[PDB]
């Protein structure tokens, strides 16, 4: 009941609230910011901004933010993509008014004092080295730099030469030009709709419109190879597909689940994954394979991801790429399309069960499209995808210009023109 209350303010702000009768509450502020909006002179400003949510503001010192949130048992977290940032606050139902006041001081009136920003520069080195213990993280940052010339090629983490040199004037300039009311959405989960609104009329004195247009992303068909001492080879091979919110984007989502997008059974052999079965015919050694799908506001990437041993890496990539070529020339059953629509339908409804997944789902719809759609509407758009559109999305990949990133012992890994 009380499904959602959706409201546009006259300054462009989006407010959405659903009244649960749950003992906990959740407030999230979603902003069009992140690493795609920085240029070559301020690379890494949005990574330092992500790490600076506890610093001194105009309404509360850094001591009062840490002590005041911990005194009631609450949390404060920041999450970022290449296209958005999100500030989240959670506590129990009777404490939500005083944590809403802390969230507005962090995002609408920060101070970046010299000695606090200088003491935080060494946290960039700790945060990046923790994330790069996963070999997937640096392969996916090399893949965006190989695929684009600008504006989606920027990394989520600060470059190494730049650690120590992010200035307070750069942080003030980034928030002034990107944290504006026509780029923001405020989503509540256990609060009524009148309470969020008079909260929202306490950040409109500045930040009245749109701040700075970003550059449109231009596709580059590049290649980056990284020889190191890891024991397995990670490789990715993509082409340009489609932006989010189109009819062709739905056909690439179905094509991902035809090929295989992760396992369903613990320690299972992936019997319905056509990519996994084609590789395992000729390879008799430990591997993994998956279909990759990344969709953004003006572009997208689709391809394959393999993890293999060094001597077997060329055999894994060639047999995975040949299976996509069979679908593009018409080999596709309607039984496999219907089974793929079931995994895509069930995965969307399961990702919205918790309060964490439901709040992120409303926040992305408010920034990208500016409205909310029921999951019954989303389930009918997946039903309208035909078998001719799945074959046509696999033909765009096969004839498109490729990008590649690899890492490990690369003595048997093929080059992107071979």
């Amino acid at each position: 009941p009380q499904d959602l209350e959706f409201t546009r303010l006259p300054n462009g702000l989006v407010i959405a609230s659903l009244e649960n009768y749950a003992p906990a509450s959740r407030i999230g502020l979603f902003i069009k910011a992140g690493s795609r909006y920085e240029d070559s002179n301020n690379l890494g400003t949005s990574h330092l901004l992500r790490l600076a949510s506890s610093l001194t503001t105009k309404g509360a010192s850094s001591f009062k933010i840490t002590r005041g949130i911990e005194a009631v048992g609450g949390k404060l977290s920041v999450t970022s993509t290449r296209e958005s940032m999100a500030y989240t606050v959670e506590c129990l139902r009777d404490d939500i008014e005083i944590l809403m006041e802390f969230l507005l001081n962090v995002t609408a009136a920060p101070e970046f004092r010299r000695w606090e920003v200088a003491a935080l520069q060494s946290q960039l080195r700790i945060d990046k080295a923790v994330a790069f213990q996963n070999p997937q993280a640096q392969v996916l940052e090399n893949l965006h730099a190989a695929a684009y010339r600008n504006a989606l090629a920027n990394s989520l983490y600060c470059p190494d030469y730049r650690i120590g040199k992010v200035t307070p004037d750069q942080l003030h300039y980034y928030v002034q030009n990107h944290f504006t009311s026509a780029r923001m959405a405020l989503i509540g989960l256990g609060v009524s709709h009148p309470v969020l609104k008079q909260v929202a009329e306490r950040f409109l004195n500045m930040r009245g419109g749109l701040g700075l247009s970003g550059a449109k992303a231009k596709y580059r068909g590049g290649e980056i190879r990284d020889q190191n001492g890891d024991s397995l080879v990670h490789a990715a091979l993509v082409a340009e597909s489609a932006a989010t919110g189109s009819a062709e984007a739905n056909a690439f989502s179905v094509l991902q689940h035809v090929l295989g997008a992760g396992p369903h059974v613990k320690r299972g052999s992936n019997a319905t994954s056509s990519l996994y079965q084609a590789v395992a015919k000729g390879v008799h050694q430990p591997f993994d394979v998956s279909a990759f799908n990344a969709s953004y506001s003006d572009s997208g990437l689709f391809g394959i991801y393999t993890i293999s041993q060094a001597a077997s890496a060329g055999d894994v990539i060639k047999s995975a790429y040949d299976q996509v070529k069979a679908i593009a020339q018409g080999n596709l059953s309607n039984t496999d399309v219907q089974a793929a629509k079931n995994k895509l339908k069930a995965g969307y409804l399961m990702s919205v069960e918790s309060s964490e997944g439901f709040l992120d789902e409303v926040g992305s719809q408010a920034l990208v499209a500016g409205s909310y759609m029921q999951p019954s509407t989303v389930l009918q758009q997946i039903d309208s995808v035909a078998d001719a559109d799945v074959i046509n999305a696999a033909k765009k990949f096969v004839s498109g210009r490729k990008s590649m990133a690899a890492s490990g012992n690369l003595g048997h890994t093929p080059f992107v023109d071979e």
Partner: protein, 57 residues
């Protein structure tokens, strides 16, 4: 229309005030772990991975 986490694959980092930093969604994607000898190494700046985020209370 939707998130980048719905059409899964592009990754996301988090920072908390009282919890640990997380990277990505499908980066530790599995049945590379049922095939043998996938070891997570010992670290020099090592972290807690379950990180209180699924605690029983």
């Amino acid at each position: 229309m939707l998130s980048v986490a719905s059409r899964s694959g592009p990754f996301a980092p988090v920072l908390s005030a009282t919890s640990r930093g997380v990277a990505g969604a499908l980066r530790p994607l599995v049945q590379a772990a049922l095939p043998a000898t996938s070891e997570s190494p010992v670290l020099d700046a090592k972290r807690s991975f379950l990180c209180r985020e699924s605690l029983s209370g």
